[PDB]
Amino acid sequence: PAELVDPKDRVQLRRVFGDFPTGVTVVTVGGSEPRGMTANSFTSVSLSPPLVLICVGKDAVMHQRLTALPTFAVSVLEAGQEKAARHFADHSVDQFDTVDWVLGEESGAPLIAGAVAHLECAIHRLYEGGDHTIFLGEVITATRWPAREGMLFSGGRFRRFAPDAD
Amino acid sequence: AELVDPKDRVQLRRVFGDFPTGVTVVTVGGSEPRGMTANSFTSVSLSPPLVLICVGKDAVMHQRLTALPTFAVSVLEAGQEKAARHFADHSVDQFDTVDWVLGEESGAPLIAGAVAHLECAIHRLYEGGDHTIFLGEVITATRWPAREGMLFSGGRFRRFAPDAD
Numbered sequence: 571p572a573e574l575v576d577p578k579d580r581v582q583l584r585r586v587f588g589d590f591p592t593g594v595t596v597v598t599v600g601g602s603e604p605r606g607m608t609a610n611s612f613t614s615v616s617l618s619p620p621l622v623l624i625c626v627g628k629d630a631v632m633h634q635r636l637t638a639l640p641t642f643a644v645s646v647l648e649a650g651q652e653k654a655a656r657h658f659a660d661h662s663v664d665q666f667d668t669v670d671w672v673l674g675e676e677s678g679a680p681l682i683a684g685a686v687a688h689l690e691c692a693i694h695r696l697y698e699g700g701d702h703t704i705f706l707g708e709v710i711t712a713t714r715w716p717a718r719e720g721m722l723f724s725g726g727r728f729r730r731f732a733p734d735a736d
Numbered sequence: 737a738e739l740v741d742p743k744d745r746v747q748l749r750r751v752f753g754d755f756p757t758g759v760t761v762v763t764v765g766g767s768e769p770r771g772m773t774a775n776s777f778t779s780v781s782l783s784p785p786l787v788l789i790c791v792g793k794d795a796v797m798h799q800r801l802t803a804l805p806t807f808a809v810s811v812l813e814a815g816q817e818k819a820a821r822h823f824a825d826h827s828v829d830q831f832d833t834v835d836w837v838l839g840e841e842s843g844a845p846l847i848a849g850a851v852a853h854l855e856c857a858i859h860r861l862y863e864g865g866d867h868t869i870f871l872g873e874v875i876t877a878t879r880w881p882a883r884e885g886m887l888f889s890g891g892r893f894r895r896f897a898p899d900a901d
């Protein structure tokens with residue numbers, strides 16, 4: 571039975587936003603106090619120049635970091651990394667002593683070990699996005715592990731792929 | 737590990753495909769209604785309620801979106817690969833192979849059987865390299881809770897495993 575959504579109702583809006591499935595990333599930065607934040611707003615944008623974007627809430631600490639720093643990293647989380655996804659979504663101590671990570675050579679940001687891919691990006695534009703800021707980054711380098719497959723987030727829940735039937 | 741040269745578009749597409757997404761069909765109305773398959777759909781903001789899509793500068797839909805006040809997004813359900821392929825084909829009624837309903841608010845075709853329809857007003861146009869980023873405000877939406885979206889990952893259509901919980 572179809573549910574009509576009142577866009578002013580944020581409970582309902584979050585329900586419909588949840589209808590579009592995504593992967594899950596952890597965005598990280600270096601600097602004097604490196605930080606990570608779980609993000610599903612990651613979107614690949616352009617091939618030439620190679621661009622991606624993320625949308626970050628204005629009240630997140632990560633927002634203040636990204637506005638101040640020239641680069642960030644994206645770690646696309648693999649199917650078995652729900653613990654890492656939850657950890658970097660916690661609002662609440664080294665944030666990174668729970669997880670295995672390797673230093674990003676271009677971003678100076680911790681890259682999450684076990685990820686499907688790492689992308690290190692230079693911040694190119696900041697665009698207004700309502701209660702978020704849209705950060706457009708140019709991909710400086712990336713590394714991927716072809717054997718790995720991403721975790722999923724849909725309907726407000728973490729989910730898994732069915733193995734490819736072809 | 738595979739090191740990716742970002743200037744190599746084959747490699748770059750491989751890494752872009754490592755982030756799984758759903759699949760939408762973006763539609764517009766007007767004299768010549770049009771649809772295009774898009775996975776760059778992203779929900780952005782709660783207040784105001786905003787979403788974005790990234791559309792190639794050379795796409796025919798690109799000119800529509802820069803000109804028209806509204807568009808619709810149909811989030812495709814798990815069994816809708818045929819519609820995804822159809823609205824991604826480059827080469828004429830585009831809507832004679834799908835079940836669709838006119839959206840009252842957008843004036844654009846809404847794809848039947850979808851997980852959700854979102855009808856949006858174009859809010860901003862932002863530079864996005866070889867794409868334009870279209871930011872839209874959600875005017876109304878309808879959803880079907882029992883449905884689940886189709887998935888696109890590694891350049892292939894995929895489906896969910898049953899929720900363990």
Ligand SMILES: [Ca+2]
Pocket residue numbers: 576579
């Ligand atoms: Ca209400």
Ligand SMILES: [Ca+2]
Pocket residue numbers: 741744
């Ligand atoms: Ca090459």
Ligand SMILES: [Ca+2]
Pocket residue numbers: 725880881882883884
């Ligand atoms: Ca559902």
Ligand SMILES: [Cl-]
Pocket residue numbers: 580581782
């Ligand atoms: Cl809220």
Ligand SMILES: [Cl-]
Pocket residue numbers: 617745
């Ligand atoms: Cl290409």
Ligand SMILES: [Mg+2]
Pocket residue numbers: 592610611612613614757775776777778779
């Ligand atoms: Mg996205």
